[PDB]
Design a binder for this molecule. Structure first.
Ligand SMILES: [Cl-]
Lengths: 231, 244, 243, 241, 111, 250, 195, 235, 240
């Protein structure tokens, strides 16, 4: 009310309203799902269009050969953060000849988002990210929120109606976690998960967007006729 | 942050006016009146000191009339402290020109640059404008004798006779009435004093409440002399015109 | 009024309302504690299991500074991380210049001055965390607790978060019943119990326990996480006491 | 009314932020006292440790600025420590630049000038503290100089600060009216501390245990604080007379 | 006075056919009259069917290859995984080399 | 972080008033009375030493300050603001004059430099005006003795005699009756003490009054001998005893 | 760059400047005009380091032309020469100084007098009846000391100038490919096409 | 007042949302993409009859293979075009090749959000960026001040955008010829324009692989206008 | 440095600071530009509340940017000097690097770009000025007349007016100016310009300034008597 003019102001109950308004931008965004087994990690994303004449907004971005994310909210903010991740992954490779740990990737994003919430003039990032990857400690899935909070999970979902997919994964936890050495089945589980967040619309060939990374699989994105298999 | 406390000094009103410039002009309108009159053979500068106290040291005092160089002087109306900042800048600018070209600075060039500084404070920087209006009186070999005025907006114009500060409306009407083009310095001296004597808010115009200066070619052959009048010299010129 | 709208503005009381508002964010956070012992310190924290989908043991909240200092905090987790990042820079530059690892009181003031600096200007926001930290140095064991205002003191026991009062009460009993001192292994067990007892104030979601410790004898003066058998032994001890 | 939020003049020529910083001074509810002997300067302050979980050894409002200068603060501890760190740095730099130990009164002026800047510059808030500096200066002898959020400072024969400052002040005034001198006519610092505690007891009307007080003593070439047992020894001497 | 350059010896050779191209190079690495390694590769697969070797001062050679390999990586990120053509790679390498016109990479580069 | 206040905190109001300067002058009005009188062979500046506490040593707090050997200053208004102005005024006398010309500045020019500093606090970003009015008495070879007043706006005026602060209106009237152009220095000191007694309420003695003069050169206060041209400071602070001697024949 | 001369007579200033541009063992051009018009009644010839000369001349030209537009007024030759000197005086203590020597020939319309200024790369200004830069002076100065008179006409000045060029063509080691002559007077600047 | 980079309670940037309102006030611009080329057309909208309409430059060349139309506060587009032209030429210098239409659009869109308290406010202009490259062929992009860009088969921006977009929805198919697309832009422009459409108050342009980006003459467009009127009367 | 974003969008999609800068232009004295077959004429109003003026030294309303291009304006006089200075510097810089004077379009584009930059730069307000820029391109005999405004938009005009009561004089020009046949001579072009100002001015004495620009850097300002002859001629034909 009087305490939402900028990010530098606390409310009387100890809330940061600008950070909460940034969180709101994610809820308006199109749904995206993340899940993993022990061998692979999968991102599924429902893409959104302006109208029938327009293209579908790309949700998934590659960060390295072993890491990438899906976005929900302000796309330009995801571009800034993904570019930062690309640089950090790259710094780790050039300087230490070392693939950046997915956990450190999260720690770096947390600290970059935080600085924008404690200083005058700036604003919080208006996007949520699901980071997947495969590093020296196996498969990983992270959830980034622009408050700074990063969380490691077996599965999750963000965006509009993400609660449906998040409930499904909470039921299916014991099943999909043990889908080891089988990419297509882990994707099927993810496609069935995102389907619990659909209303009136169904998954079409230029609507669905899938990405996968794992033990002997680089981070690759599937669009167009390449996802027709999973409909 | 600090946005909360920003007055925004360099913005437009809905009517397309600059708030701070308009309010600075309102400030200047309460300052002691200063008059400049340009004659064919010289220029007069006359100014009224702000309500004087009897224990003020009058002879070793400078409030209104300042010397910029040997050929140019200014009469001040507004905040004296603000004027001195600008005067020192103008003095330096005149010496830069002389150092560069080995010639005394043309009057308009000095006026334009000082006016350009004022303009800057109205368009950028977020600072309050200078609450000062000048009357420039000077000579150069291009245009001869010249009178200019500048104000907080940074706009300047040339004049045959002009007043700044308090009661300019009344003062300008009186000057417009009695001024003519073939006028001499001695006549202009009389006009300047007569005008102040009628427009003054004081009971009677006396030597101790005035500053006076002339810029004549009254020196020996083709050269200009600046005369900043002493207290006794103002006392004499006031008697000679029959005001006291 | 309007005195609470801007940071670093004194109210007519002589209070900085923005800092007091940051304390509300801290009170909203999960419970964390610190226990000083014979030859070291023990840290523990409550991790709320929001969902089955959270990977157990893989959202670590306690942070190490240098090799001998442990830090835990309650409130805005990112703000706590920012503070620890600074702590690590402060500790690094101390060791760089003076060779010896930073003493705990010296370290405590470095954070204190940094947090206090964030109450001096309206262009920054106060920290939304109370930080419990400490370790072992040349002068022995030290436990500290730092607040949004920059205020810190040494402590025999410390607690903050949503269940601070329950934890404080339980900590006070240990100080009374053990005047000669509490051992390191005992303090780990006690820490577990107190977190479980403090969880009564946050009992909708079930939780995950996380403990760390520095001890001159048990960990050789270095900060280590409590894991495996020693962790499960502490959990069982806590489970037996609630029933 | 934004003239009450930053350090600019109000219509009646006042700086409300400076005035409110003075009220922050008493937020800790602690009273301090400083007196001068022949050879020494003694400063005493109340020590209140409400929480049982606190480590009482770390609870202090007295600081050792340099080897010769001591400082007691009345106000919140974060601003107190802020002032203490700056003073320490200033005293160290002074010694390096000018080749001799910074006098108590010079440090007081320097810290007072810094406090003045915060009353004139908008982006910096005043510190809500009153700094009392004490030493045995090699030129001016026993010295007490006190700074406030307004940037004001002055030397003192003796002084007191805190909520019940006025009661302590008049108590000291009435003593110096009686003794007819500028100081405590006493040889050892031990008895000057005993005087300081005795007159604080009379003024405040409370009795003190060893843990209820905090004592700082300045002698020639060193300033030091007393332990609990040093104070206890001092309390025994008062009771036995 | 410190001399920032050194000579690591070795030689490289590139030949182009109709539908193929070879880039050869010996595996010996030396300083003065000493052998440092009998097998130290200096011909590298940089991706997009581009092979590269920067012979001369090995520290500058490694630095250049490392930077070009990185240039290929970012070309994919910035231009939708487009294949970097050999002619485009060549022009990109010119800018890498000329970027240090006043403190050069002491190498002969062949791709 | 960083000083984000790069804008003016003093601005023109619709009526043409500069509020902060007016309010600064109001602070000066609240301040303790100080005065300055110019004689034929000297200048005197005086003020009351308002003690904050009887335990406080008023000797340590100096309201009358030496700026150069021939220039002194006193104030009315906010003490801390005055103290830092004295520091800056002493320094600018060296940096912008003595280090260039090898001699101390004349009174009018030092006053001009102090006025400049006070003007900048009226226009610069993120600052308030100084809450003091100064009276600067001084001597120099080509201008002789002079007395200046400096206001928060940066405006300065030369005075034969004047007063500022609490009871300035009455004190100025008193000085108008007593001042003539033939006053000797001792006569000016006598008038200063009479004028000041009217405004002072409590004790009136050498310990509660602070008074300094700009008069003859003082070779005994120079600290060294051997250079004929160096004859000593014209600024001298009257002692507590010297004041009490003149209070008997009052 | 090599030979630049200047002669002030009764009613005009005459500038002569060599046409050759040489680099190494090749005369790259034999019709080079080593001068720029700074204003309608002011002309500046130049000589010195390659590149620096033209860069400096045009920089001065731009500044003087800017002044003329701003004030709607032509600067006096004395004023222009002082401006040029100060630029060179700054330059000499720069990281890389302008190595350019100039002659400034102008007609002052207020005084109705011709004026010739000689300025070297250090910023050393002198007003002269006749001037030269480089090795040219070692021949022409003594020659002009003898034959020059202050009351000479423009035609007499051109004959006096022919006498200098002939001497230089006889005794100078390098072939400078003749000179471009220009006259500055009350009617402005014009070039003599047949010299 | 309030911060420039402030979020609303709904999770949108106030300034970005306000700049979009300025774009709705701007003159209409329409783009249609075909397999034979991309067509770009704009409403000139002269404020007075004395204004020489040929000086109204709302269609602009970025490179030989990329063109651009604008709508909104058109003065803001100058620095955007300048950046685009530099980006396009710079990439050719670094890589000896034409730059992808998408990569060019991304480069322009990176400027968009570089505002705050960098420039003082967002751009108040939307751009239609049309071009061709070897990889993705003929393309049409809509670049907003939000930093977002969508590829479009057809798109209208400006005051008559929502009415024109609904018309494009029906009329567009994947087998449109270039001539058919030219007429379709003129047809839809004539519908949404206030004043009557002619060669002086409307301007056509196209980009083809063979001839590159070309702005049409007033003589050429006039014949297409005459051809359009005859075809509508023919049934 | 002062960073504040002064020019910002409002809920309805307007930048008020830019629009308030237009109000300052509307307050300014009227300025008119008319281009004939072989010339351009710039007419300017001078308000007559200022007597005792010195017209020798008072800044003229029409300013030469180069020998072939001129700039007149309406709005804040102090602001105009900054634009004129920048334009004059750019004019000399163009000659230096391109070895050719500026085209009228190029000079206009530069000035308009400066005006635009001040509408989205922190710490600055927009120029309260609209300009009329007229002249002839190098080695060209086609007349050029351009207009700029605070927002930064610029365009070419056959004839145009700006300033106070400009909507009245624009109305006059819209019916009196034929595109098919512009003023064939200098006299015809000046007369039409004077006629248009006489709809608004007051008296045709020392209130109207006229500046004629012809090809190949041929610019001259008319004197009082010369202008007065047009005023005398127009009034006699009017009484009919
Ligand atoms: Cl200081």
């Amino acid at each position: 009310n009087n305490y939402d003019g900028d990010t530098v102001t606390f409310s009387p109950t100890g809330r940061l309203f600008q950070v909460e308004y940034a969180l709101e931008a994610i809820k308006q965004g199109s749904v995206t799902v993340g899940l993993r087994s022990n061998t692979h990690a999968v991102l599924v994303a429902l893409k959104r269009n302006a109208d029938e004449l327009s293209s579908y907004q790309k949700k998934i971005i590659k960060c390295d050969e072993h890491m990438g994310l899906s976005l929900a909210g302000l796309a330009p903010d995801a571009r800034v953060l993904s570019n930062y991740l690309r640089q950090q992954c790259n710094y780790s490779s050039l300087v230490f000849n070392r693939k950046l740990a997915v956990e450190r990737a999260g720690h770096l994003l947390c600290d970059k988002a935080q600085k924008n919430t404690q200083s005058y003039g700036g604003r919080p990032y208006g996007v949520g990210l699901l980071i997947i990857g495969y590093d020296k400690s196996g498969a990983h899935l992270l959830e980034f929120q622009p408050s700074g909070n990063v969380t490691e999970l077996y599965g999750t979902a963000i965006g509009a109606r993400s609660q449906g997919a998040k409930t499904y994964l909470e039921r299916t936890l014991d099943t999909f976690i043990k889908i080891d050495g089988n990419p297509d089945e882990l994707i099927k589980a993810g496609v069935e998960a995102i389907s619990q967040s659909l209303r009136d619309e169904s998954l079409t060939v230029d609507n669905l967007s899938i990405a996968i990374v794992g033990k002997d699989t680089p981070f690759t994105i599937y669009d167009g006729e390449a996802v027709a298999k999973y409909i | 942050g600090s946005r909360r406390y920003d007055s925004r000094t360099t913005i437009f009103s809905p009517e397309g006016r600059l708030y701070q410039v308009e309010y600075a002009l309102e400030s200047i309108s309460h300052a002691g009146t200063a008059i400049g009159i340009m004659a064919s053979d010289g220029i007069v500068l006359a100014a009224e000191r702000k309500v004087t106290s009897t224990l003020l040291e009058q002879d070793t005092s400078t409030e209104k009339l300042y010397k910029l160089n040997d050929k140019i002087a200014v009469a001040v109306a507004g905040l004296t402290a603000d004027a001195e900042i600008l005067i020192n800048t103008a003095r330096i600018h005149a010496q830069n020109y002389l150092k560069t070209y080995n010639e005394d600075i043309p009057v308009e060039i000095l006026v334009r640059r000082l006016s350009d500084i004022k303009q800057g404070y109205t368009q950028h920087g977020g600072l309050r404008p200078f609450g000062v209006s000048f009357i420039y009186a000077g000579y150069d070999d291009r245009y001869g004798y010249q009178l200019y005025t500048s104000n907080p907006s940074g706009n300047y114009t040339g004049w045959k006779a002009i007043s700044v500060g308090a009661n300019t409306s009344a003062a300008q009407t009186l000057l417009q009435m009695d001024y003519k083009d073939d006028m001499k310095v001695d006549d202009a001296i009389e006009l300047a004093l007569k005008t102040l004597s009628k427009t003054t808010d004081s009971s009677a115009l006396t030597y101790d409440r005035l500053e006076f200066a002339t810029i004549r070619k009254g020196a020996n052959d083709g050269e200009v002399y600046q005369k900043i009048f002493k207290p006794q010299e103002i006392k004499d010129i006031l008697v000679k015109t029959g005001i006291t | 009024t309007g005195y609470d709208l801007s940071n670093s503005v004194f109210s007519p009381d002589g209070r900085n309302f923005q800092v007091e508002y940051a304390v509300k964010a801290v009170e909203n956070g999960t419970t964390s504690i610190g226990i000083k012992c014979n030859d070291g310190v023990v840290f523990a924290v409550e991790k709320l299991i929001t969902s089955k989908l959270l990977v157990p043991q893989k959202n670590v909240k306690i942070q190490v500074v240098d090799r001998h200092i442990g830090c835990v905090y309650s409130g805005l987790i990112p703000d706590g991380r920012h503070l620890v990042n600074r702590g690590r820079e402060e500790a690094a530059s101390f060791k760089k210049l003076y060779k010896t690892p930073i003493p705990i009181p010296a370290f405590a003031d470095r954070l204190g001055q940094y947090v206090q600096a964030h109450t001096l200007y309206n262009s920054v926001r106060p920290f939304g965390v109370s930080t419990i930290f400490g370790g072992v140095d040349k002068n022995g064991a030290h436990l500290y607790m730092l607040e949004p205002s920059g205020s810190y003191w040494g402590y025999k026991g410390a607690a903050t978060g949503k269940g601070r009062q329950s934890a404080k009460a339980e900590l006070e009993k240990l100080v009374d019943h053990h005047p000669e001192g509490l051992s390191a292994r005992e303090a780990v067990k006690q820490a577990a119990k107190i977190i479980y007892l403090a969880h009564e104030d946050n009992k909708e979601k079930d939780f995950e326990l996380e403990i760390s410790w520095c001890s001159l004898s048990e960990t050789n003066g270095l900060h280590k996480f409590v894991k495996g058998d020693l962790l499960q032994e502490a959990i069982d001890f806590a489970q037996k006491e609630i029933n | 009314g934004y003239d009450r939020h930053i350090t600019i003049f109000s219509p009646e020529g006042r700086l409300y932020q400076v005035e409110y910083a003075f009220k922050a001074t008493n937020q800790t509810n602690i009273n301090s006292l400083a007196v001068r002997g022949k050879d020494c300067t003694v400063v005493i302050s109340q020590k209140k440790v409400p929480d049982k979980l606190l480590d009482p050894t770390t609870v202090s409002y007295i600081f050792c600025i340099s080897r010769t200068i001591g400082m007691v603060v009345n106000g919140p501890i974060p601003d107190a420590r802020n002032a203490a760190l700056r003073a320490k740095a200033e005293a160290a730099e002074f010694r390096y630049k000018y080749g001799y130990d910074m006098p108590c009164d010079v440090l007081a002026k320097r810290m007072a000038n810094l406090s003045q800047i915060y009353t004139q510059r908008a982006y910096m808030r005043p510190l809500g503290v009153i700094l009392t500096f004490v030493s045995v200066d090699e030129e001016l002898g026993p010295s007490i100089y006190k700074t406030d959020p307004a940037g004001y400072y002055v030397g003192y024969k003796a002084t007191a600060t805190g909520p019940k400052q006025q009661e302590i002040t008049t108590n000291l005034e009435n003593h110096f009216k009686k003794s007819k001198i500028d100081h405590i006519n006493e040889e050892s610092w031990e008895k000057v501390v005993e005087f300081a505690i005795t007159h604080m007891i009379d003024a405040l009307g409370t009795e003190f245990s060893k843990n209820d007080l905090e004592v700082g003593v300045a002698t020639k070439d060193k300033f030091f604080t007393l332990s609990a047992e040093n104070i206890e020894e001092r309390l025994v001497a008062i009771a036995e007379q | 006075q410190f001399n920032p350059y050194g000579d690591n010896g070795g030689t490289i050779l590139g030949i182009a056919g109709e539908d193929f191209a070879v880039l050869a190079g010996d595996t010996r690495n030396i300083t003065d009259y000493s052998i440092n390694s009998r097998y130290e590769p200096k011909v590298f697969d940089c991706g997009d069917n581009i092979v590269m070797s920067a012979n001369g001062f090995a520290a500058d050679g490694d630095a250049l290859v490392k930077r070009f390999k990185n240039s290929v990586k970012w070309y994919h990120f910035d231009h939708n995984d487009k294949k970097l053509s050999i002619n485009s790679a060549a022009r990109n390498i010119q800018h890498l080399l000329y970027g240090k016109r006043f403190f050069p990479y002491y190498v002969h580069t062949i791709i | 972080m960083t000083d984000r206040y790069s804008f003016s905190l003093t601005t023109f109001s619709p009526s043409g008033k500069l509020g902060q300067i007016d309010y600064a002058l109001t602070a000066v009005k609240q301040g303790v009375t100080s005065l300055g009188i110019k004689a034929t062979n000297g200048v005197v500046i005086a003020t009351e030493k308002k003690s904050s506490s009887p335990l406080a040593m008023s000797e340590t707090l100096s309201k009358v300050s030496l700026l150069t050997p021939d220039i002194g200053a006193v104030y009315s208004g906010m003490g801390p603001d005055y103290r830092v102005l004295v520091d800056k005024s002493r320094k600018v006398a060296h940096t912008s004059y003595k280090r260039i010309y090898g001699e101390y500045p004349p009174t009018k020019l030092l006053v001009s430099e102090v006025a400049k500093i006070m003007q900048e606090a009226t226009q610069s970003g993120g600052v308030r005006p100084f809450g003091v009015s100064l009276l600067i008495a001084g001597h120099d070879e080509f201008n002789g003795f002079s007395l200046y007043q400096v206001d928060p706006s940066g405006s300065y005026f030369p005075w034969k005699a004047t007063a500022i602060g609490k009871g300035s209106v009455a004190a100025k009237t008193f000085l108008e009756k007593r001042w003539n152009d033939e006053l000797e220095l001792e006569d000016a000191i006598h008038i200063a003490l009479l004028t000041l007694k009217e405004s002072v309420e409590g004790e009136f003695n050498g310990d509660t009054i602070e008074l300094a003069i700009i008069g003859d050169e003082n070779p005994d206060l120079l600290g060294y001998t051997g250079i004929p041209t160096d004859k000593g400071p014209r600024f001298r602070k009257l002692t507590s005893q010297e004041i009490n001697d003149r209070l008997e024949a009052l | 760059m090599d030979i630049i001369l200047g002669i002030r007579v009764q009613d005009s200033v005459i500038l002569a400047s060599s046409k050759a541009v040489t680099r190494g063992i090749s005369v790259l051009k034999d019709s080079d005009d080593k001068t720029r018009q700074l204003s309608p009644h002011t002309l500046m010839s130049f000589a010195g380091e390659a590149g620096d000369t033209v860069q400096f001349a045009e920089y001065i030209q731009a500044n003087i032309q800017l002044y003329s537009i701003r004030e709607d007024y032509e600067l006096s030759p004395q004023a222009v020469s002082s401006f040029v000197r100060q630029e060179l005086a700054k330059s000499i203590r720069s990281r890389r100084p302008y190595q350019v020597n100039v002659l400034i020939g102008g007609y002052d319309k207020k005084k109705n007098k011709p004026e010739l200024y000689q300025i070297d790369y250090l910023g050393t200004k002198v007003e002269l009846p006749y001037g030269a830069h480089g090795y040219s002076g070692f021949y022409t100065f003594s020659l002009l000391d003898h034959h020059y008179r202050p009351d000479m006409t423009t035609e007499e000045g051109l004959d006096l100038l022919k006498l200098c060029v002939q001497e230089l063509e006889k005794r100078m080691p390098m072939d400078f490919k003749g000179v471009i002559v220009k006259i500055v007077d009350k009617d402005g600047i014009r070039q003599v096409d047949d010299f | 007042d309030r911060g420039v980079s402030t979020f609303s309670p709904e999770g949108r940037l106030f300034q970005v949302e306000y700049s979009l309102e300025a774009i709705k006030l701007g003159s209409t611009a329409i783009g249609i993409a075909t397999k034979e080329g991309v067509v770009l057309g704009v409403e000139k909208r002269a404020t007075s009859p004395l204004l020489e309409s040929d000086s109204i430059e709302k269609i602009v060349e970025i490179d030989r293979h990329i063109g651009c139309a604008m709508s909104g506060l058109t003065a803001d587009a100058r620095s955007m075009i300048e950046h685009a032209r530099t980006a396009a030429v710079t990439h050719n210098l670094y890589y000896d090749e034409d730059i992808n239409v998408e990569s060019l659009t991304q480069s322009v869109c990176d400027l968009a959000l570089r505002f705050g308290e960098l420039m003082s406010r967002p751009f108040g202009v939307a751009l239609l960026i049309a071009g061709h490259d070897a990889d993705d062929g003929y393309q049409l992009f809509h670049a907003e001040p939000s930093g977002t860009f969508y590829r479009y088969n057809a798109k209208a921006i400006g005051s008559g955008s929502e009415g024109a977009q609904a018309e494009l929805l029906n009329e567009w198919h994947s087998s449109l010829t270039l001539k058919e697309a030219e007429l379709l832009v003129l047809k839809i422009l004539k519908q949404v324009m206030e004043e009557k459409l002619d060669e002086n108050n409307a301007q056509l342009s196209c980009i083809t692989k063979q001839d590159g980006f070309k702005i049409y003459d007033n003589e050429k467009t006039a014949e297409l206008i005459k051809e359009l009127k005859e075809k509508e009367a023919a049934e | 440095g002062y960073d504040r974003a002064l020019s910002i969008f409002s809920p309805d999609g307007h930048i008020f600071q830019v629009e308030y800068a237009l109000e300052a232009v509307k307050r300014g004295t009227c300025a008119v530009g008319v281009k004939g077959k072989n010339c351009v004429v710039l007419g300017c109003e001078r308000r007559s509340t200022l007597k005792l003026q010195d017209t020798r030294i008072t800044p003229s309303k029409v300013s030469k940017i180069d020998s072939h291009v001129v700039l007149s304006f309406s709005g804040l006089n102090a602001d105009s000097r900054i634009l004129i200075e920048k334009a004059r510097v750019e004019a000399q810089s163009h000659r230096l690097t391109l070895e050719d004077p500026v085209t009228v379009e190029y000079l206009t584009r530069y000035v308009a770009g400066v005006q635009q930059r001040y509408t989205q730069s922190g710490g600055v307000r927009p120029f309260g000025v609209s300009t009329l820029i007229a002249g002839f391109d190098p080695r060209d005999d086609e007349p050029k007349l351009y207009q700029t405004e605070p927002s930064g938009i610029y365009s070419s005009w056959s004839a145009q007016t700006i300033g106070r009561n400009s909507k009245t004089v624009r109305e006059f020009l819209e019916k009196n100016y034929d595109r098919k046949e512009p003023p064939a001579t200098v006299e015809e072009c000046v007369k039409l310009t004077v006629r248009s100002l006489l709809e608004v001015v007051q008296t045709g004495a020392k209130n109207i300034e006229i500046t004629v620009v012809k090809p190949d850097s041929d610019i001259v300002a008319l004197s009082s008597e010369e202008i007065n002859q047009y005023v005398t001629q127009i009034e006699q034909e009017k009484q009919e």
